[PDB]
Amino acid sequence: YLFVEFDPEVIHTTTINATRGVSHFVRFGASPAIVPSAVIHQLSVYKPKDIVDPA
Amino acid sequence: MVYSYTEKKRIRKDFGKRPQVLDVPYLLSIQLDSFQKFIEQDPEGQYGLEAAFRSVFPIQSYSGNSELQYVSYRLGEPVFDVQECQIRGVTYSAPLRVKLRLVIYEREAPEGTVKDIKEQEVYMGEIPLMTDNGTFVINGTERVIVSQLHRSPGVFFDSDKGKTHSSGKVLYNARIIPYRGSWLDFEFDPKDNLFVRIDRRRKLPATIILRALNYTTEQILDLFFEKVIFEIRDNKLQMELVPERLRGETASFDIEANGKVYVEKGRRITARHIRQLEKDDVKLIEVPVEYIAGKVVAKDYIDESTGELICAANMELSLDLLAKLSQSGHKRIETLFTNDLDHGPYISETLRVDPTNDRLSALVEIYRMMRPGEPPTREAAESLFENLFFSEDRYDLSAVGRMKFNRSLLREEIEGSGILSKDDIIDVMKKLIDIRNGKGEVDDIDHLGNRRIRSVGEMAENQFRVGLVRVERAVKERLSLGDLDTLMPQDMINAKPISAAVKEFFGSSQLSQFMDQNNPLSEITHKRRISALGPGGLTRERAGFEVRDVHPTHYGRVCPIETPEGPNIGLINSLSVYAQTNEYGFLETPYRKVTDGVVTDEIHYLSAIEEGNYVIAQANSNLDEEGHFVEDLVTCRSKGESSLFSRDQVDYMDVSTQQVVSVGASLIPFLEHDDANRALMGANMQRQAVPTLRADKPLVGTGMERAVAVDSGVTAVAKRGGVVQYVDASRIVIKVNEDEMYPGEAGIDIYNLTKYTRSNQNTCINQMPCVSLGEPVERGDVLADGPSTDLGELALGQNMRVAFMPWNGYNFEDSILVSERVVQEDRFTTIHIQELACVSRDTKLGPEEITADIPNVGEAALSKLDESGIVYIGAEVTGGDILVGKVTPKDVKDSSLRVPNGVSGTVIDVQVFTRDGVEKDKRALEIEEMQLKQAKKDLSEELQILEAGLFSRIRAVLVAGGVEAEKLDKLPRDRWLELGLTDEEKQNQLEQLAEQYDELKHEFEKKLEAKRRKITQGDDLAPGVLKIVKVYLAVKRRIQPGDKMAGRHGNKGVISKINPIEDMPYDENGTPVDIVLNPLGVPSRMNIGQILETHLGMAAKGIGDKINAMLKQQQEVAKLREFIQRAYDLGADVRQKVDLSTFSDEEVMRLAENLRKGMPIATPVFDGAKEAEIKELLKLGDLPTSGQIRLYDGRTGEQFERPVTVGYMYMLKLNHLVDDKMHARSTGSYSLVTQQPLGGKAQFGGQRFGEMEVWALEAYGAAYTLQEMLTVKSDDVNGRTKMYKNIVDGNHQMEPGMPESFNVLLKEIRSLGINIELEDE
Amino acid sequence: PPDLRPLVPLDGGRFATSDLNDLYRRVINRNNRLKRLLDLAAPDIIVRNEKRMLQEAVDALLDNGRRGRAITGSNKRPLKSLADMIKGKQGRFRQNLLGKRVDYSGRSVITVGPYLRLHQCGLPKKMALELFKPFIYGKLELRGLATTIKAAKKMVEREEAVVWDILDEVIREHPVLLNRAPTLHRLGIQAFEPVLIEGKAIQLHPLVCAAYNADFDGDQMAVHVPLTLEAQLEARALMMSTNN
Amino acid sequence: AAQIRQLAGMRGLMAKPDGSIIETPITANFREGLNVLQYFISTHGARKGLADTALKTANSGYLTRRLVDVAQDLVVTEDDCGTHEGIMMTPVIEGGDVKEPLRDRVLGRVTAEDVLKPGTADILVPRNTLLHEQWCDLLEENSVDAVKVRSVVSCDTDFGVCAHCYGRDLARGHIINKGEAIGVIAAQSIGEPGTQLTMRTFESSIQVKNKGSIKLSNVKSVVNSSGKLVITSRNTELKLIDEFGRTKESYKVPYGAVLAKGDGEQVAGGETVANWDPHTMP
Amino acid sequence: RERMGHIELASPTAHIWFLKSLPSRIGLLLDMPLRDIERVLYFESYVVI
RNA sequence: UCUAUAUGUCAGCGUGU
DNA sequence: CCACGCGGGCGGTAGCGTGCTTTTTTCGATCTTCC
DNA sequence: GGAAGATCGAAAAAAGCACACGCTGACCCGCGTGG
C-alpha cells in the first residue's frame, strides 16, 4: 500500500496506473478514493512496535 | 509431346477433348510463397520481418540522449536437419541474428549531435523454419498452419432487414474495421439519428465526434446540407428558386414568376411543372411570410444594434424570430434544404440531440465514454482522442484496408496513409446518409471481394510484431533506467517474449493443427484449406447459417463440393485447383481473354470484384478452330447469375473444366454424373483411406493423380538428371549428368528412403524404389513411390471385381459382401505402427534406472529383455509382455513399461534419449554406431569418387611426364603418390596434387568428426527426467467383418461376411466376383457415376486381359504395337495423341508388361468419356456393349434370371477398423470423486447411460432395470461388492443402497452455505 | 471435504490442482490479511479496502463471474467455482445424476445377420466373454473346475474349452439390451437373445433396423447386460423385440 | 417419383440460397453429363440442405428435452373419474381439401356421452365404451361427424390421469394399464420426428368443387338493390354439406361479399358463390 | 469424503446467490433498489440503521 | 470387486446420426 | 544455480474487445391525469 | 398547477444453445527473494 500525493491536472491518473511496479488504484465505485489529510497526519504520527507472521 | 521415362513406363489413356491452355500450378504454393515473404530479405519494408522491424525500430528513450536502431537481420543455420529434428523430438528452427546500433547522443551539445556509437549482433530467439513439403516441425511433430478467411479491413455498409424496431423499418450501419486499432461504427437510430460507437460500447451521437474534430455547427451544416437563400427583395422577399427542390411536394401557396401561374395554391407539382419551370429559367420566386417559419436557419445571426445573437444555428424558425431578423436589417438568410426522402434532416436532429456545444465538451464526453471512472482531463482527453484514430502506432490501416476504403468511397487513388483522417470520416458519414436517402446499395458480407485470406506468413508477422513491441517496451524501460556507460545492445533486449510468442502461435493456436498423414491426398487437402474459424473470426456455435451458403463468387475460388460435414460445415473450404491469392490477399482465378470473337490464349487473373463487371463464358462451350463460338447464344455469367448472351458480348472464358472443383473433387471420376451430396461425402471420405500392402493404380482415373503425387513430398523426385549408379531398398545413388554437374562436385546424388516410419495417424509410411540399376532418369522424374503411390500415380485403394446384385440380404442397406480371395491375396491388409514411451525420471527417493533384473518376475518374462533392459528388436510381443524394465526405489518396486491389454505386434525400432551428463547405455551406443556407420558410408561414396578422379588425374600426369603406366599398374594403388619424377613442372604439379589429396582427406575427416559430434550430442529433455525409451510396434490389420470400406462416389458400407470363394457368383469363364453390392442404393442416392466407372473399369480390364493373352502367347512385337496403338487411338477427337513408332521397340515390351493388369483411363472431372466411347471401348475387347453379363449362383448353380452389372471398381479401405472400435467391460477402475466407471476404450471404461436412455427406460416401464443401471452398476460401492459376491455365489439379487453422486451433490450444496438433508419422517 | 476436491498426482513429480483449491487458498489468504490488518489497528480506508477485497474473493469462490469479472487461472480462463460444478451441462445434475457410465457394458459396430430371428442378435465371443465374466466365474465355482476366484480368472484368461462351454450355457436365455447412440424414442433400446458369432461386429436383425434408424455404413451400438432376475424378466416381457 | 424423374429426365428449376428460382433450369440428366454451371447451381441447394440438417439437431434435442421435462411427472393412477366432460371432435375441414377424417382421430378413444344417431334421437353408442375399429365403422356407417370424447386435459384425477380418459395404449390392443408413464412416451413421440421437420424460413372470390347444400354460420345479411345477398358480419362461415348430412367443405367469407346463391340452395362444382374486393373495404 | 471444514470469517460477507440472482432476496426483503445494496456492500455509500 | 494397470480440463478434428 | 512462498489481470509508464436469440428487469423521458 | 402513477420504448443483464464414441497435442502459477 502506498499513499501518493499528486494533482491529476499535472499528471493524469492513468499514467500513475501504468507506472511499473504499481498494481492498481484503490478505488471505491467508478472514481478513485480520496484520502483525507487527517489520515495522512495520523499515519505520520502512527508509530507501532509489533511483529509479523514471518517473524 | 514426348513422354518422360516415368510416363513412358505406363501411359494413361486420356479421354478428354478440351485442349489444355494452362497447366495445373504447384498445389503447395500458397503455403510456400507466403512464408517466403515472411523470411526473404526485402529492401522495401512492407512484408515480413523487415516490415515489422521498420514499424517498431528505431526506439528512443524518455529523454533525447540515447537511441537504439535496427540495421539488418539474418537467419542462422539450423542446428539439426528436418529428419534429425523429427527423430529427436526437437523443433526445426533457425536462429535469428539482428544488427542493433546503440547511439549515445551528446547531451551537452544543444543540437544533439551523436556522441558514441556501438554496433552489435543480438540473438532474438529461434524462428521455426518451414519444410519444402509445406509443413512445420514443432516438437518433432508435423503441424500445418491453415489459412483464415476473414473480413478485409475497411468500411462496410450493412442494414438490418426489419428485424429490429418491430415494424419492418431498416436500420443502416457503417463499420470501419482496421487491421490494428479500434473499430468504429455509425448507426441509424430509428428516430432518424446518427450514433457513433467505439469498440461496441454504449452509443453516442456522431455530432460529438464531428465537434471533437474541430468542426463548428456552421461547418457541419455546410458539409452535410445544402443552403437555400431567402433574400429580402424590394417586396415579397423573393428567393433564389431552384426547381429541383420542388420535386415530390405540394405548394400550399401560389407561385408568381414573370406573371405566369405555372402552379396554383393547393395542387401537387408534377414533372411537367418542373420542366416548365426549368424552361422558363425562373431564378427568383415570391415567398409568403408564413412559409419561412417552416424552414430552419443554417448560420447563426447576431444583432448589430443590441450586440446579441438574433438566432443560433439549427433550430426551427418562428414568426417572432423572422420579425426580429427583419427589424435587425439582415437582407439575406440561409436555411437548410430538407426533404421527406431526398434530403432527410438526420444531421440536424442529431445536432439537436447531443448536449455538447464545443470541442472541449465533446472531448470530455468522449473521454468519459472511453474510460469511465477516471477524472476528465482536457490534456488526457485530447491525447486519447488523438491516439484513438490518428496515431500510427495505435491505429493502422494496411494497404489492402486503405485500398478497400478508397474503393468503397469511390476515391480514385488507392494508396494512402494508414491513419484515419477527418475527410474520411466525413465521407463515410455522407455515404451513409446517401444510403439512407435511397442512393447506393449495402455491401455483401459473403462476397469474396469483402473477405481476404490470411496465410501463415501474415499471422507469423503479426505475432512477431506483438513480441517486438513488447521487447521495445522492455528496452525503453532498460534504457531509461540503466546507466549510459557500460550497456551492450545484447543485454538491453530479452529474447524470451519473442520465443514465447512464436512457440505459442506455432503450437497452441487454433489454426495451427496436427497434420493428417493418412494419405498424400489428405496432406494436400489439409495444406490447401481455408478455415473461417480462429482468432478474430467466426465461432462454431455462433457462426450462423447465411454465411455457410455457397456464394456465386465462389466459382473458381472455393470448391463447394469439398466441405466438412458436421458442426463446421461451410466454415472450412478447400482451395480450387487454379485458385490463387492476390497481393492484397483476395482470391483470384485465371481466365482466357476473348478479343474480336476469338478466344486468345492470354491468361488474366481476375478477382471477385473485377469478375462482376465482365461477362465470362462457361468452360463447357463448344469451340471450333481459331477459337470461334459455334453457337450464336452462349451461356455466360455476367453479374452473379447465368444467362444467354451473344458471341460478341463475351469478354472472358474459363480456362478449364476443373476450375470449379478442388483437388479432392477433381480426383473423383464421373463427377458430373454424381449427386452433389454423394460427391461431397466421397470427397471428404477419400481423405480417410489408409495405405495398403501394395499400391494398385486406379483403372479409371482423372489424370490428376500424377500432379498430387509429385506435388506432395511422400515420393522421391530426382533433383538432377542422370543414371542410377546404385539402387537398393534403402538408398538410391544416382550419378548426375556432366551438364548438370556443379563445378568442383563429385557428381552423385544420394536419396535415403524412409522405411516403416509411423505417421500422425499411427499408419505406416514406406518408400519403395521404382527404378532399376542403370536406368537413365531426368529431372522431375519420380524415383521411389511413397505410401499410396504407384509409379508416381496416387493409389488410395484397390481395383476389385464388383457385381451389383442382392445376395441373400447380406448387403441390405449399405453392407458389403467380400470374397475370401480378397483376404487371401492380402489386397486390403494394412500396417499400423504404434509408439510406446517409457520415462526414467529422478524421483526424490532415488534416481530410477532401466535394469534387466525386476522384482517378482518370471524368467520366461525376461527372455525377451536383454542385459540393457530393453526388448530385443524383431521379437514378437503379445499383451502383457514387458518392453522396458524400469525399477523405482521404495527396496525397489517394479515400474517396467508393459503393452496395453489386447495390443499385439512386432518390435521394429527402439530409440533411447539420454540427458547430457548421464551414462550412455550400450543400446544407445549401438544406435549411435549404426548411425555413424551410415554417415561414414554416405561420405565415403563421395570420398571414393573424388579420390578415384584425383588418382586418375595424377596417373595421367605421370604417364605424360615419365611414361610409367606399367609400373603404376604393378605398384600398389596407394603408393602412386610417393613416386618421384624428374625436376620439372611435372614434379611441382605432382606436389600440388598431393597437397590437394591430403587437404581433401582432412576435410572429409573433419566432416566425419562433425557428423559424429552431431549424432552423439545429448538430447535436451524436460526437467526431472533423465531418460526416454521409445519402442515401435508394427501390427498387420487384415480385412474382416465390421471394417468400413467405401468408394469414390460416396457409397460406403461395412463388411458383413467373408464368404468362401466357391460361394461367389461366377460367369461363363468361371471367374468369381470379389465384391457384391446392393443396387438399391444407386437410384435413391442418385450416384450414377459409380455405374459408369464400373463399366469403364470392365472395359479397361478387358483390354488388359487381351494384352495379357497376347503376352502369354509370345506374340511378336508388331502385333502388340498394333493392338496398343489401336487401343490408344480409340476415341472421339481426343486431345491425347500416342505414337508407338518412336519407342525403340524395347519400351513397348515394358509398357505391355505394365498394361497386363489393365489399361488405365484418364476421365476428366467434367470433360470425361461419353457413353458411346465407353461402348466402343467395350466392343474393342471381347465384352458385351451393354455392360451386363450372365452369371451363375455359386452355392446352388442354376442360371440367374436377369443379367447383372459386373465390372471393376476402385474401392477404398476407410480408417475405421472394427478392432479399434470394439470394447467391453465388466469391472474395472472407478473415478476418484464420483465413484463412477471411467470413460474411453484406452482407460477400459464403460458405456455411458445418458439422459435419452433413461427416458427410454422410463417409457418402457422397466423400473428394476433402471435402478440396477443407476445405483448397483455405477455408484453404490457396497451395492457393487454385494452384487459381485451374489453373482459369484449364484444368486441374482440386488440391494438398492445409496448412490455416491447424490452424497457428493449434498456435500457441495452444504458447502454452498445452504442446508440440505433427507428426513426419515 | 478434500476427497471431493482431490489433489491428483501429475505422474511427473508435480501436482494437478483443482480450481476449488485455488479459490479456497485465495479466501484463506484474504481472511488472514484482513485479520492481521484489523489487529494492527489500521485506519478506515485500508480496512475498508481489505474487507471489500475479501468480499470479492468470497463471491468469486461461491459463484465466479456472477458479479464483476471472473477470476482468471494460470492459463487465462475463468476458474470453476462451487456453483459452476452444479449447474450447466457439465454440472453434477446432468452428468452424474440424470445419466452416468455403467458397468457390464460394451460398444461395437453393427452388421446384418439375415439368418437371425426377430428375438436374436449376434454377439462376438470375446465380447460376450468379457461382458459375462462374473457369471462365468460363478458357474465355474459351482461346477467345481475351480476352487478360488484366482483359478477362475486364470482359466478365463487361458481361454479353455470348458470356459467356452460355460459361456455357451450361461446365456442360453439371458437377454441383453442393444441401444443406439441417438435414443430419440423408446424403440432406440431393445432386448435381444445373444447368439455367439465369430468376429468383432454385432449382428443385427434387418427388420428392427427401421426401429433403430440404423444403417450398416459404420454405425456403432452399445450393449448392456441385465444382471438381476427382475431386470431379466423386464427385458424379456417388456423390451423384447417381439413385444414391440 | 422425384428421384427417378431426376435420373432419367431433366433436373428442372432450382433455387438460389435466398430462395429465388434460377431463370435457366437444368436440361441435363444424371445419366448425361451436367456442365460446370448446372453443378454449381445445384451445389447451392445441396449445401443449404446439408446445413439445415446439421443445424436442426440442436433445436430438436433442446425441444425434446424440454418436452420430456414438462411431462416427466405424468403417470396413470386411476381407472375412471366419472367426469362427463370432454372434447368435441370433427374431421378437420379447410379450403377445398379434407386431410384427416373423423375415424382416424376418434379411433382408440372412449366416449364422453351417449352419441346419438342423427335424425332418430336413438343412442348410437353408449357413454363409456372404448371405440375400436368396429365402433368406428358403425359410427361412419351412420354418417356421424361430431363425436365427444374423453381427453387427458379434461381428466379430473389429481396428481395423475385415469386410464379411461387417456384411452387406448396405442402400442397394444387393450386399454392402457395402470402405472404406465405416458408423459415420457408422449414427449418422445413428439420429439422423434423433429429431425424430419424443416427449420427453414421460406384471391377475390371463393370456388366450389363439389355438389351439396350451402349453410351459413354467424350471418346477418341483407338483400341489395339487384336482389343479391350481402353479409353484414366479420365472422361469416360457409359450409358445403354432402347429401349424407356431414360437413364436406368449409370457408370463411370476408366482409362485404356478394352472394351468387342463397342459403340452402344446391350448387355445382366450378361455380362461384361469394365475390369480394380485397383491395378496399366498402 | 464426508467430514467438512469451516473458516471463521473476521467480517461478515453477503451470500452472492441470495444477492445477485434476480430478483434479489435481500433487496426484496429490504424493499430497496439493488444499486444501493451494491454500494453499501462494497463500501461505497453508508446506510443508516 | 480397491487386484494389477486406479487424472483432469482446453484446443483441433473425425464418425454415426 | 537449487528452493520458495505468497497475490494473481497483464503489463505497463495503455489498452485489450468487435458476426445470436429469447426473456427479464429497470430507467429516462414523457405524459397525462388528477385534487 | 405541481405531484403521482404510469407507461413505453430503449438499454442492460441473464440463460441457452442434442447425444454417443474415437484420435492428437498442451498444460496442470511465474517471479522477486534467499541462501
Ligand SMILES: [Mg+2]
Ligand atoms: Mg449411416
Ligand SMILES: [Zn+2]
Ligand atoms: Zn380421467
